[PDB]
Amino acid sequence: ENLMQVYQQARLSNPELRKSAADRDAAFEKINEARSPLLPQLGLGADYTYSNGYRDANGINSNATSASLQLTQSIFDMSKWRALTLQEKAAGIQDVTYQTDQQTLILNTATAYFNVLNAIDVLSYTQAQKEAIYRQLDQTTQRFNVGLVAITDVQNARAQYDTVLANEVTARNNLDNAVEQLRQITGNYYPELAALNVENFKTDKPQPVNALLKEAEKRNLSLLQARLSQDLAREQIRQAQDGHLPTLDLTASTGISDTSYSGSKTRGAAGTQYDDSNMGQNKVGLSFSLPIYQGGMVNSQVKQAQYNFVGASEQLESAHRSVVQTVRSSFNNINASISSINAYKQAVVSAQSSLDAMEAGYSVGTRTIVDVLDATTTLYNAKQELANARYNYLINQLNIKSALGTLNEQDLLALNNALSKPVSTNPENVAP
Amino acid sequence: ENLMQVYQQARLSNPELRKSAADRDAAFEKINEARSPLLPQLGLGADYTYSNGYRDANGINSNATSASLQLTQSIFDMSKWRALTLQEKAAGIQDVTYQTDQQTLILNTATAYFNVLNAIDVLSYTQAQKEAIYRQLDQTTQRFNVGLVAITDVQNARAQYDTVLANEVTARNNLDNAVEQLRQITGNYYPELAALNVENFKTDKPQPVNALLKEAEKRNLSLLQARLSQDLAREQIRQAQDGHLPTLDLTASTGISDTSYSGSKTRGAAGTQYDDSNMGQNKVGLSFSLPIYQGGMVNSQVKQAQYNFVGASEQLESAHRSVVQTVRSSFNNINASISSINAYKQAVVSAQSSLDAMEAGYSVGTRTIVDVLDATTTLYNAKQELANARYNYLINQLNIKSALGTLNEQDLLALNNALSKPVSTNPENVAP
Amino acid sequence: ENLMQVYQQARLSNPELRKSAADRDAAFEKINEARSPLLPQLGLGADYTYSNGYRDANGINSNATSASLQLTQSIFDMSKWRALTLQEKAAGIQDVTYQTDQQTLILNTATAYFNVLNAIDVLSYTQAQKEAIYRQLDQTTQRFNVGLVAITDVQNARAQYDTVLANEVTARNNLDNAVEQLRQITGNYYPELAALNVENFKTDKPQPVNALLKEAEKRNLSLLQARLSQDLAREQIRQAQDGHLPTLDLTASTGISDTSYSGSKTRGAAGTQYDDSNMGQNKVGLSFSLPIYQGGMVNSQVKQAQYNFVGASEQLESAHRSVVQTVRSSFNNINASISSINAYKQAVVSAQSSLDAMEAGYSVGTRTIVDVLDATTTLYNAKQELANARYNYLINQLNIKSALGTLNEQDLLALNNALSKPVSTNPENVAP
Amino acid sequence: CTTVTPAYKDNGTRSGPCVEGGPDNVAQQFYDYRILHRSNDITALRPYLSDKLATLLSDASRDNNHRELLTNDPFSSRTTLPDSAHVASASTIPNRDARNIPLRVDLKQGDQGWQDEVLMIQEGQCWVIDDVRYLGGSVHATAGTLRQSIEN
Amino acid sequence: CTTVTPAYKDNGTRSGPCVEGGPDNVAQQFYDYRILHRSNDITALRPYLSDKLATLLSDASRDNNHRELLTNDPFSSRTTLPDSAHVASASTIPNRDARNIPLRVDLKQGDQGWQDEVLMIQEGQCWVIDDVRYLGGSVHATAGTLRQSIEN
Amino acid sequence: CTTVTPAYKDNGTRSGPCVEGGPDNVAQQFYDYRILHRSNDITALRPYLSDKLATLLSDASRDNNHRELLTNDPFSSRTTLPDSAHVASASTIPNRDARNIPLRVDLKQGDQGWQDEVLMIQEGQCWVIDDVRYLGGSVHATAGTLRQSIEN
């Protein structure tokens, strides 16, 4: 299928994208865990304690059965709210990195799909070179069998044929590896893909690097992640102290206790404090705490958070510089690709003219067979380089679009609008 | 020494494998730390408190010296058992990654050994090319000294000789770097190694990719590690809740306390509650706890564990796809190598015949010195490529055996059975 | 600007170096947090508890308002001192890694600055080759217009011209990418940089690899980091037990409590135990704790620390082997570079002589235009390779100086003393 | 609170019918249907396989090349129908942002076990068996998993 | 105790005058000076930009190419002078081992916001404004940040 | 419980005798023997060096090239025999899965210290000295550690 269906199947059945999305969802669900301690904390607890006397408590045995139902609430504690905001920012940066992962998936699938086509083109060109050299071999061998020229031409052309055969084997292996890699990135085996037609291949100049830089700075994913990380560091230093703020808690508890006494000394004439006691008590209360001198722990924590915030800001600046470098490199690479397309078109036309001239000269007799073989290999190398330059230009267009920060399926549709004919990627079928 | 001795010395004296084994042993010993909290926890504690009083408790001073010996056991707590099982699974995955490290070491030592041999072969071939070009230089220079041909041939052949000299220098540097790298990976300086003979070098076709893929899927180390990680995620989600299960503890404690009272107001006529008390208590008790409303913390933790398990399963599927890609790539590369061996043998034979034909033509006078120099360059390049293809095929065979997942010293023995003659790797001895 | 000013600007405004320095400062300030628990811990706390009676305690209501001021000190606890020592060692290793980062910055800025010059030289050489081929094309075309030779030579020369044009486009793109990368690593846009003159370029033989190895082993940064890590592991195993040593604490507290009773049953005739109590008590006490049977936790932790220490020792040994490999590789690379400089100088001279000879032969008529074009491309390739070898030798000298562990701005001054003439890096200006 | 709101409004295009849901649930139901009956033919097994293993098995049957593999057993690692199956548990699946989940099922017979592995594809509001990884000793025939075993 | 003792005996060479210090402090003071007055010309703004943005703006003004950008507003994302500014907080800066701090300032007008960003450089014992990232919708003119916009 | 059971059924091939064991123990014993006696010749030192440093030093002695290195002191960083040594402690070694442990020994003389380093190799049930890293100022002769110093 063409690029659209390949990308759709890749997006629908990719494991790494699924993993990144699951990680983002887990980071999002962490908000509830972060928010849990602010909500009421309710619990139950029962116990049974048996006490035997000793020393001056000789002959004293006690049995206590207790039950309790407790509830605790944090009336004022800024640390919990700061932790909640930290979790919020972490979820935000995870969402951003998920978006970056989506962009990476699109770029990777496009690169692999075009690599398969480039390998097919390379193999076909090498096979055509082998056919041409075989034709030259047959013509020279038949001329020698009739008898016009020595064996040197036959030997040289045979050596060239063998070298071209080795190159063809290498190209076939490379194509097989590329198609298997495409299957791995997609999850399906594709027998044929849409090729690239040269009639409708029209190039377009890119936008000036100024507006490119403006949009990239405003809407890059990596720079947005760096900004979110710096904001997270700022909230971390804000949370860092959490020691100068007094804390306030509210507690409630319904409890029952049944105590029974027994022993040799417990059967005395007192009969007042040595009898079974059944106490029920429901309690409500408030607790106030305030650290005053923590030993310098809070000050050191605040200073460490300040250093961490400085480091995060510096990492953001590094990310911005990297974004500028990426935009400039992508623009320059696009311009180089569009120039090289025309350069290689002119070069291949020139090489064809040169090969025709060398063949005519050999017919006259001024040249030798090594010269025409060199012209042939130069022609086929030029054709191979032109095809590679075309595919590199398309991939580079996608690369600059991605670095701008606004890459989606519309760009893939624009690329796919230039693919018309289907070709099979079967190694045996192409070269029977 | 041959490959067996090199591998044995590498295994016996490698720091990275030792570090991996130490890490595995530490993760294995983590089981005792995980099992410790389930066992009885016994302790001792003594204290002495001086109390002074004021306000309505004016003129009351107390001195209390206490000692205690405590024992605690966890009668029912599934969290500890789940932690123990998690530690067991972690130890298992560490054992698996240690096995993978062993495989990586064996592959690395074989690769370094054969890289050294390939460097030696390349250097020898370049030296032979330099000798041939020097012979051509001497012949042409003596012919010109007698006087038969212009000075152009001398200049061209001298330029070729200088280029070949530069190539020889860089090849010698590469060989020295390779031998030093081998010494680094092994720990010993090897003066001579077993070379590769061409009489006993016989190639064998690999097993069909079907049974290869079957055995690789069954026995691959990375896939087994991924499966163990997914099982670990399942046990993590099983442990995740640990909040709906009530906990039960048993405590025992033998304690002594001595309290003495003194003060201006303590010398009154009461004489009952202000006397020295010697309390002794041995207590045996049970404690029962049950969370009921944890504020949603347990539910959020369970859902996070669910997401983590989904992510782990996705990672396992990614590992399986990568394993399939590795097996297919290894098979295709092995077939490419075995074809290229024959292709390059035919190519080098053809190139030698072509060089002989060009020499005969130059003797007749049809060709020129640049043509015979180019033929010499092509022949020596073909020889170098054939040797490189041979070594690449051997390394590739080891690579596919490793990707199958059943690589050990038997494959090393199979490779070493093909090495017969020893050659010295000293640059000075090989370059007199 | 020359290398000194470029490096000074890079060091003044580098984000990654600033981030590493901030991380080092944070790890250095962690000492105060580590030392905090040893210092006195002082706090305050007040509460108000309301109790309602139930069961046999019916008709009993109590209201207790309390305030307290507490102070705690750790009289004897070796765990805190060991944690302080661990923090000290961590700060030390962070300082070492910061020094390594500084060295890496110097090496990177030098490499980029010389890469820009190498790209400029490559572009200029390619443009000169294009000019020479254009001159040859014009001469051949005018000769054919007058009419002396067939059309084959024109075709071949123009094919070579097209190929050289494509190579020139590629070289210009590479130069633009390199200058942008230099701006990114430095933070400023440089219109011109000091070039490398060939009159004052004199090479120097390096010190014997023995003294090199001695100084490197004594003063390498990576080896020092590994040694500090092993010492940290030793202190970790020393700290890891912390279970057989009894702990001792001292506590002081000033507290006030006001309790009031009310209820239906509290208005009886007792009037003794159901009245307001105002207790003011200050306590000073000591606490002694001693683990005796921890369930094997301490023994397992100690054994894990032993394994970790063994792993750290193995990592240090690996680091030492890598250092030896780096030193040997750098020395061999310098020797290869200094040999190749002379080899390529001789090759360039011989290639120029060969090109002159081919031109003379073509004037006579014994050669063909393809031969002189091949000689021209060989000469220009040799010149390009010589320039690249020079720029690689300088970088190799800096690399070995860095691997020795004693690289600073003085070495940059030594390099910069060899740069005299300035050249502009504008793509359009150099090739109008 | 704080609903996850997964960011995938996709993963649909379901053609044939299927069971309610639950990966372990559908795997257990499929194995129970195969064990209880004796046919195991693909015509009655259409709901439990999604859209691709069904057509792959259909064209393999019409190809007449893998007759032995498709007639003995396509889904079990042996040549004989198992006696009991126990699918690895999975505590449901949160929302829909999850696909291609593999589960290992213990295929227990009389004093024997093989513990095969089967992939799971969501593709809508449902769950469906796929692949079957043939993870066990004495593999039935061909090699690898079923999908690449019958792949041309 | 255990003072940091930073390893940076560098980061100096400041020529022109400036305000006392503190990143948020200097950024807020510079914005307040811009809004309170109506000139915004570089001669009066010399203290807040240290040594490179001042000269770049000077030669851009003398270039007679960027008249529109340099006359409407060079420091705000719009063509109109803002109404209020709120710089992002930063709890001072430890020691002196800190440079190139980027701060985002919320640039609020009547029922509008643009939230620009500005780099800040130490240059000795002080703090100075730099770059101004032009982060906001409807970029004023040219493109990118100010330094790239006016770079030749 | 849960014994480690190391996976290393190797690391043998020991020829000459040696001391009981313990890396710090054997290093301390070697240094004490060298300090107490005055011979420091290799024949009496055979048990402490393993199998390779012994033969390497023997053939270096028979080579008559490193006489100056071999006659004053090969194992200390100086040309004079030390006065006291203190090997870095190591809390024994678990099981046998541990090899090539480098220990730094403080080599203290009258108002001086050099703090050299020595490698430790197991070879079976024992421990033996190797390399000696020559970590100290003003090294004796040649350069590097002893192994590269006497290597041809």
Numbering used by the authors:
A (entry chain C3), B (entry chain C1), C (entry chain C2): 23 to 454
D (entry chain P1), E (entry chain P3), F (entry chain P2): 19 to 170
The study reports:
Tripartite efflux pumps are essential for Gram-negative bacteria to expel a wide range of toxic compounds, including antibiotics, across their dual-membrane cell envelope. Among these systems, the AcrAB–TolC complex of *Escherichia coli* is one of the most thoroughly studied. It comprises the inner membrane RND (Resistance–Nodulation– Division) transporter AcrB, the periplasmic membrane fusion protein AcrA, and the outer membrane channel TolC. Structural analysis reveals that YbjP, a previously uncharacterized lipoprotein, binds TolC in a 3:3 stoichiometry, bridging its protomers at the equatorial domain.
Native purification of *Escherichia coli* membranes yielded a stable assembly containing the outer-membrane channel TolC. Cryo-EM analysis resolved the complex at 3.56 Å resolution ([Fig figs1], [Table tbls1]). The inward-bending HTH coiled-coils occlude the periplasmic tunnel, maintaining TolC in a closed conformation—consistent with previous crystal structures ([Fig fig1]). The YbjP globular domain nestles between adjacent TolC equational domains, forming a stable 3:3 complex ([Fig fig1]). YbjP features a globular domain and a structured N-terminal loop stabilized by a Cys36-Cys144 disulfide bond ([Fig fig1]). The N-terminal loop of YbjP adopts an extended conformation parallel to the first α-helix of TolC’s α-helical barrel, forming substantial intermolecular interfaces. Buried surface area (BSA) analysis reveals 787 Å² of contact with the primary TolC protomer (green in [Fig fig1]), and 1037.4 Å² with the adjacent protomer (light green), suggesting asymmetric binding energetics. The N-terminal density extends to Cys19, which corresponds to the predicted signal peptide cleavage site, positioning the lipoprotein at the periplasmic face of the outer membrane. In the closed state, a complex network of interprotomer hydrogen bonds stabilizes the structure by constricting the pore to its narrowest point at Asp396 ([Fig fig3],[Fig fig3]). In the closed conformation, the coiled-coil helices bundle tightly, leaving a ∼4 Å diameter sealed pore.
